[PDB]
Amino acid sequence: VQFKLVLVGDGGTGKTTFVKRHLTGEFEKKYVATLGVEVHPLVFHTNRGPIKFNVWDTAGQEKFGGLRDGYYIQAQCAIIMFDVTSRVTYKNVPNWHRDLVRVCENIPIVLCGNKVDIKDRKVKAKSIVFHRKKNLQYYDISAKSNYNFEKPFLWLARKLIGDPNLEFVAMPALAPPEVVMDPALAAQYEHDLEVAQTTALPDEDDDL
Amino acid sequence: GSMEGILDFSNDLDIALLDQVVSTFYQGSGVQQKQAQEILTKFQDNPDAWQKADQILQFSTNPQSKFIALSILDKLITRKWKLLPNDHRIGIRNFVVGMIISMCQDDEVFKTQKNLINKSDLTLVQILKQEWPQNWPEFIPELIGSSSSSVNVCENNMIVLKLLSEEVFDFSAEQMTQAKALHLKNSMSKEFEQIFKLCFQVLEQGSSSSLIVATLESLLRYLHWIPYRYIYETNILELLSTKFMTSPDTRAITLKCLTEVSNLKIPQDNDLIKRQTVLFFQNTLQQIATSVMPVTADLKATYANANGNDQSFLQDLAMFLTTYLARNRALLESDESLRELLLNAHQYLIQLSKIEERELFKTTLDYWHNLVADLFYEPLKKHIYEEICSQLRLVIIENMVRPEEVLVVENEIVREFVKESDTIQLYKSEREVLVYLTHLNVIDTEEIMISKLARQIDGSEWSWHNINTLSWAIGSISGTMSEDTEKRFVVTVIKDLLGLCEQKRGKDNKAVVASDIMYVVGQYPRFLKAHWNFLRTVILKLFEFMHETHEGVQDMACDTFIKIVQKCKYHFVIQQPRESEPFIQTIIRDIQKTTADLQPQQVHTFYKACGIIISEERSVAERNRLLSDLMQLPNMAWDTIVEQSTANPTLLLDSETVKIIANIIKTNVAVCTSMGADFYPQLGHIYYNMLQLYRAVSSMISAQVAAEGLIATKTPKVRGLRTIKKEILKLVETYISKARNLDDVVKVLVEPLLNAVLEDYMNNVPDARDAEVLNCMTTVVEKVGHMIPQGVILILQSVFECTLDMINKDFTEYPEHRVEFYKLLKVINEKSFAAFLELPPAAFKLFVDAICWAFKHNNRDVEVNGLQIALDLVKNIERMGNVPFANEFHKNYFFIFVSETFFVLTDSDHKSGFSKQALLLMKLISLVYDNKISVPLYQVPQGTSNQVYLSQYLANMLSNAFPHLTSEQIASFLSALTKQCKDLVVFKGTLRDFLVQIKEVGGDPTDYLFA
Amino acid sequence: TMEEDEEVLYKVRAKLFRFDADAKEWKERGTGDCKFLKNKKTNKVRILMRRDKTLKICANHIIAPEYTLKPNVGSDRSWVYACTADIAEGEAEAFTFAIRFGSKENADKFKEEFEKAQEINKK
Ligand SMILES: Nc1nc2c(ncn2[C@@H]2O[C@H](COP(=O)(O)OP(=O)(O)NP(=O)(O)O)[C@@H](O)[C@H]2O)c(=O)[nH]1
Ligand SMILES: *[C@@H]([C@H](C(N)=O)c1cncnc1)n1cnc(-c2cc(C(F)(F)F)cc(C(F)(F)F)c2)n1
Ligand SMILES: [Mg+2]
Structure with missing residues (x-):
């Protein structure tokens, strides 16, 4: 039960950071431009079963665009991403959209305005209307704060599975094993643990 | 494995190998997919891959492979068409045409290869942009003609016309020059009569829906312009x-x-x-x-x-x-x-x-706002829509979104986590429409609201959702009623809401209903001002909730308090009839009792609200006495902590002492924020010891880095010491930015401040410098810089070179220093430019470097200040007129700024700044075309005008940077650009026309005559 | 769900990290409710933690008695400890974990409860 999801938008808007948060739970602060595309599978557990997305995280910087619209072939859904701290990225949303629906003419598409965590917002809420005429779903999101991070995938999953009441459910939790530590490498986990103890956790001013 | 063989072009291409790479990319997974992807990218990017295109379209069995061949042609057509020899051009045309005809006659391909036919039509359209109509004037006639031959070809011709209208009218502004866009628009306009004929006949005829839907989709596009x-x-x-x-x-x-x-x-x-x-x-x-x-x-x-x-x-x-x-x-x-x-x-x-459906609701709510605004002004309209407006009142009232102020929510009624801002704009738009609808019929709105309320009292309709949405609606229409109807309305609403918290017991009930009463009373200050006995009871009740164990109610009680006080402050300073004292006196007396169960942030908000009140008292003597009463606790705790720091300066080790100091300083910051200029007596009370404590905590931080390494700046202890330093700076900044007596700022505040902060900043290691030092200095220079020229010099010397070295190795480290640094250079450059003139020549050169480094950021905060500094700096030098400093400035730096500006304009990585980059460039060019540079810019024959040399420098500069341009393109561009350096809008159009031409070969040089 | 055969001894909101010893950085793994669950049939206590809105497991492992909570150099509200058999991602991998809480009180109460559990598992 798997669906091809293409992710598009200008460079720097936070596409790869958004996926990676869903893959691993981490927040990558560095900007390493995506080269062509990166494919990751991503599974959600719903009350209607598991749904699997094959996420084609494509590249926003033109000089890294690779096959460009060639990535869109046979996509079943998509996310268009812009950055609400960068007006230029909203203004290009119509260009990504044009190129996406020339290849994929009838697929569910979400428009996501990322980085609403940043105090100085530039793309005002009232100004975000492109999606109305094109029947896109729209959400404010932040990959850094997780604000609404799940809503694009919950929406798409409802549209793909055909069930507006589909919800995410807790995966069942198998008993964990009773493993005793290895005395051969017990003198070794002094070091691995020393490093981690003296590396400071990121973002110590956060509420958590 | 051997997938890379297709990248070797010595031999002929193995189409079957190509197809295996493709299917490994699309249909594969994991490493083979990731490796096929890199192979295909390298295959596509090869400047000769296009020659392999026609053999991939002839002999391949994979539709994706053919798509990718077409992407290769598209790239060639859009960027390099006119460099091709004319024979390859017609071959490519005839091939693309022939593949389309060939695919639309095979009914099975036409059905199942939709993606590939669409891609082919788009490719053909790319050829039209380049060739049509001047070298293909019968394209439209033939297209109309061939539409009779078949139903599949007619349907596909519509797709071609749809894509053509899009590329010419909807998406040409950014992708073509003005002149070319006009040419194609006029060409389509001239031949539209015929196109419309075909489209109107198809629609009347009525073959089958497939052709119809395509003809309509094309029509959707035509309507944008016909x-x-x-x-x-x-x-x-x-x-x-x-x-x-x-x-x-x-x-x-x-x-x-x-x-x-x-x-x-x-x-x-x-x-x-x-x-x-x-x-x-x-x-x-x-x-x-x-x-x-x-x-x-x-x-x-x-x-x-x-x-x-x-x-x-x-x-x-x-x-x-x-x-x-x-x-x-x-x-x-x-x-x-x-x-x-x-x-x-x-x-x-x-x-x-x-x-x-939030977004659909926003779309309809926009229309209702258009309607009700019209009905509030247009005579004789509103009675037409009475029953519509009546229904809309109910819709809006039952779908009110939660306001910012209401901090409780269900998951179990608990506290918020996050500032819902997708909700903030909605609430405002709901309020606006509802306020209009209340003006349009105030009696109907009250009847709706009171009956809904009567049906909560009855439990007839009780629920979280229902009482809340009603309460938010009731709050949101404040100021639509007359004072008298408001009076009777609010009374009823409160009476009913009080009845409801006595009925609905349990911890979750009482938090819901308490948040609703707070919202409502906080929204009716006009009422509270007139009913002092009720206002006093409300405040005492809020003080009661400040001891509530439900954290949501408690945090809301603090915010409701200050929200009420911002509006009713005057009633807390006067002595009310029947009162033994101003109520402010009663609040201050009891502040330790009132605030004892609050988190510190909430304590500071409480003190901030008391400062709002104290600032209503305009007798100076009486205000200063209130201020010292308000500050009694933090000042006794301060006087204590400072005798115990002076005597044996080591108690500050104590993590508890550190928290205590920071909260004292944060309390002063809160009160200073609401009292402004009036805070000065309190600041003077602590200023000298505060600056001594600043030096003392600076020594502590230094000594901990020294003993533990850089990692010490991550420890709880050192972050706490730095918080002390940051809050001292914030307090001083906050005061100075609202001060009305600048003579005292200069004579009392500034010198001790600079002695306390600047060397400590300069002689710390980089990871221990606080970027707030920069922010503080920016406010100082902004507010009194003109009075402290030697102080501004001193600021530069202490922070300029050492900060630049922190931030000139990449664009990412020390982000906050970066931003604060260019903010400080900006204000120094506009208010105390003389500081830069006394800079040594080496350091002035680092300053120019610093400005140009900002241009290259993508961080908009930095970039924009960089461009603004550059522009202001030019203005500043121009104002000196014809003197040595300005002439040596032009000799040394003029072409550095022209070429750096040109760099960020053309590299495709700094689009956000186009408007300011163009501005700077037009200013620079205009300096030369008005002979406002009184010195030759060169080292070329004598007597040459600076204008002639500028043209020469720029033609040479662009010729080496964009060698694929012809001399004539460059010369026409510069001719246009210099002629337009007093007309920003046309100048910008000409730069945009250049940015288009540098992306292709063979740009027409006459395009720059467009204006 | 596979949890109705268990009793909740302790719940707290936390942020969980996993140390990437190759990159030498901590990497967040999830943010949600951290629970101590005591198996009604075996009396074995585990940590189970789920992400807030996807509800995805981000920690599932026995609160072994061999484990020891250490402080992290940057925080007075966090604990580092090494885990040999965590199944949140599937195969029982080994991790160095850090878990941070809203406050230092939350962190200290967690350490108390974590240690009590170790005694219970000591049987
Ligand atoms: N403050 C904030 N920053 C974010 C957020 N999401 C992503 N970022 C930041 O945006 C920057 C770009 O990261 P990235 O996810 O790779 O963006 P991208 O669109 O995938 N880049 P590209 O298209 O070139 O491959 C990073 O520095 C990242 O920390 C967010 O939600 N909030
Ligand atoms: C009901 C009840 C009570 N008799 O005060 C109560 C409920 N919770 C906690 N403590 C007491 N109740 C609920 N809310 C009020 C209330 C609230 C305000 C305030 F929101 F603070 F403005 C004001 C008033 C008053 F001014 F007294 F009407 C009552 N009472
Ligand atoms: Mg990316």
């Missing part, structure tokens, strides 16, 4: 509004066509056109009622059910109705025979407005 006559002087509106509304195959595209038709503004004097605008609306609404849904249908349930394309049809319908009615409802409001039409349409909108 003349009104093609719509109103034919029978095409009757077709759209009737025939194609009935079939659901065509109904979606037709509605979108009718929305575009709507949106135009009609010639507002012709009775015929007006009647036609009415008729197509009347036809459309009859087909909806009869063939889709009657006006009573439950569109909320239909949309929730999400069968088929319902959700999209309802959205398109909402967009059609709102679009047409905002433009044209006046066509329906006077003729009595049009009244049911007007109202049925608005009745559909009432039903659309009950769907649960």
